[PDB]
């Protein structure tokens, strides 16, 4: 049924969402990594700068 099909075009829209989500925790896991091994300003303090 395409409402389904529509609803699964939603959910892999938020696969799509979650796969950006799922790089983004990993840029951020690359700041964790950069932050942590800062060479840098403040770019690493309680958040990021």
Do not use: Q, S
């Not at 796969?19 to 990594?33: H, I, N, T």
């Not at 942590?36 to 300003?41: L, N, P």
Request: glycine share 6%.
């Amino acid at each position: 049924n395409k409402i389904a099909l529509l609803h699964k075009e939603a959910e892999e829209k938020r696969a799509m969402i979650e796969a950006k989500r799922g790089e983004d925790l990993l840029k951020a896991e690359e700041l964790a990594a950069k932050y942590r091994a800062t060479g840098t300003a403040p770019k690493k303090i309680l958040g990021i700068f």
